[PDB]
Ligand binder design. Sequence first.
Ligand SMILES: COc1ccc(Cn2nnc(-c3cccc(C(=O)NCc4ccc(C(=O)O)cc4)c3)n2)cc1
Ligand SMILES: [Ca+2]
Ligand SMILES: [Ca+2]
Ligand SMILES: [Ca+2]
Ligand SMILES: [Zn+2]
Ligand SMILES: [Zn+2]
Length: 167
Amino acid sequence: YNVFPRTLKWSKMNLTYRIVNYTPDMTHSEVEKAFKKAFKVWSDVTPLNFTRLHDGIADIMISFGIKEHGDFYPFDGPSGLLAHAFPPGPNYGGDAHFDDDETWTSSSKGYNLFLVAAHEFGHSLGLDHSKDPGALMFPIYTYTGKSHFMLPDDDVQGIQSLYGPGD
Ligand SMILES: COc1ccc(Cn2nnc(-c3cccc(C(=O)NCc4ccc(C(=O)O)cc4)c3)n2)cc1
Ligand SMILES: [Ca+2]
Ligand SMILES: [Ca+2]
Ligand SMILES: [Ca+2]
Ligand SMILES: [Zn+2]
Ligand SMILES: [Zn+2]
């Protein structure tokens, strides 16, 4: 016999993702690089590994859409909800959707896709929102302006509570 797992986490360390479609705002390459960097944030502090697929069903299916886009979490035009993602699991679990009514950039203008992706992949991996305003998993986008990205300790603690450290 088997019982359902108690914790919403991935029970495998080698996970896949797929970019189902792309935003007008950035090149394919820029979008691909943003997501690769976002996943590296989490793999740097856990035993998790991430591979991109060009077809089929990946664990983490990534898409861009607006307003109603095929679930109970419709988008709302510029600002507000920037994106959403499902907790670990089969099917919809882990999937991440980005609001293409946002202006996506790789800078301090509009919303930084790497930054939002890093937050959403946190949800995809099992993290809910933090109550710490400085944490990456705080609900509200608050660009620091700082030169290089460093994952705040609250988010390291959170993710390592599910998966432990990389080594
Ligand atoms: C929904 O999407 C959301 C995304 C983020 C938050 C909360 N949140 N807002 N900012 C930070 C947050 C947390 C920790 C650091 C920073 C930050 O700005 N670092 C500077 C930086 C950013 C991007 C790049 C790059 O592009 O290479 C380089 C450097 C931001 N966490 C909330 C929601
Ligand atoms: Ca999935
Ligand atoms: Ca929005
Ligand atoms: Ca757009
Ligand atoms: Zn959605
Ligand atoms: Zn969130």
